Amino acid sequence: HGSASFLKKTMPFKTTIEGTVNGHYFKCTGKGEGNPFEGTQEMKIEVIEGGPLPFAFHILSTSC
C-alpha cells in the first residue's frame, strides 16, 4: 500500500440485532464509526423493541 496515506482512515458501520434472552424478545439498531488500522471504534446502539431491557445490556456487548 506504500504508506498510510493510501489506506482508508475511517469506515462507518450499521447493525441490526434481534434475539431472545430468558424469554424476552428485543430488537436493536446501531450506527458507528471506526479506524480499521488503528483498531478503534465507537457506536451508538438503540433498543427499538423490547426496551427497556429487563437484563444487563452488557451481555450484548460482544455481539453489537
Binding site: 482508508k8 469506515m11 462507518p12 458501520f13 450499521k14 447493525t15 441490526t16 440485532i17 434481534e18 434475539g19 431472545t20 434472552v21 430468558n22 446501531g30 458507528g32 471506526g34 479506524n35 480499521p36 488500522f37 488503528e38 483498531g39 478503534t40 471504534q41 465507537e42 457506536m43 451508538k44 446502539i45 438503540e46 433498543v47 426496551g51 427497556p52 431491557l53 429487563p54 437484563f55 444487563a56 445490556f57 452488557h58 451481555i59 450484548l60 456487548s61 460482544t62 455481539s63 453489537c64
Partner: protein, 167 residues
C-alpha cells in the same frame, strides 16, 4: 466488529482479507453462574459502509444473578487466543464483569470466524492473541440507548519472550 483491529508483528488480518465479500462469526458464551448467550453474525460491505446482522439466543440466566438483576458493572479488558482450525479461525476468551461491589462474574466465549472467501485465497495467521477493550462511554437511557467504545490489538506474547524463537 472484528474489522477494527490493529495487527502488529506482521500477523495476517483474516478479517480485512475477507472483503469485499466479508465474513461471519458464531459464538456461544458460557457464564460461570449458568447463563448461555449464543449469537450468529453476518458482516458485509455495502459500498463504503460495513453492515452487521446479528441473531441472539440467550438462556438459563439465574433470576438472582447480576445479568437478570441488571446489576452488572463493566467489562474488564480481555485477551482472546486465536488460531486456525478446520481451515477457519477459532477464538476463545475469558471475560469478566466487574460488578458493583468488587466481585467478578466470568464467562468463556467460544467462537468460530468464517471468511466468505475460500481458504486458498487467504493467508492464515498462526496462534496469536487479540486484546479487546470494550467500554460503555454513556448510558444515554437505562435499557434503551448506549454509546460503546472498543479498542483491539492483534499481537504475540512479547512480554515473556521465547528462549527458542517461537512466537
Amino acid at each position: 466488529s472484528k474489522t477494527f483491529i490493529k495487527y502488529v508483528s506482521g500477523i495476517p488480518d483474516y478479517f480485512k482479507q475477507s472483503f469485499p465479500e466479508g465474513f461471519t462469526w458464531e459464538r456461544t458464551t458460557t457464564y460461570e453462574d449458568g447463563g448461555f448467550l449464543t449469537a450468529h453474525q453476518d458482516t458485509s460491505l455495502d459500498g463504503d459502509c460495513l453492515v452487521y446482522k446479528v441473531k441472539i439466543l440467550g438462556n438459563n440466566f439465574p433470576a438472582d444473578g447480576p445479568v437478570m438483576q441488571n446489576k452488572a458493572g463493566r467489562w474488564e479488558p480481555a485477551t482472546e487466543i486465536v488460531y486456525e482450525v478446520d481451515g477457519v479461525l477459532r477464538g476463545q476468551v475469558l471475560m469478566a464483569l466487574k460488578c458493583p461491589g468488587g466481585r467478578h462474574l466470568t464467562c468463556h466465549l467460544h467462537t468460530t470466524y468464517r471468511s466468505k472467501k475460500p481458504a486458498s485465497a487467504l493467508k492464515m495467521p498462526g496462534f496469536h492473541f487479540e486484546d479487546h477493550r470494550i467500554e460503555i462511554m454513556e448510558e444515554v437511557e437505562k435499557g434503551k440507548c448506549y454509546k460503546q467504545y472498543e479498542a483491539a490489538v492483534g499481537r504475540y506474547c512479547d512480554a515473556a519472550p521465547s528462549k527458542l524463537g517461537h512466537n
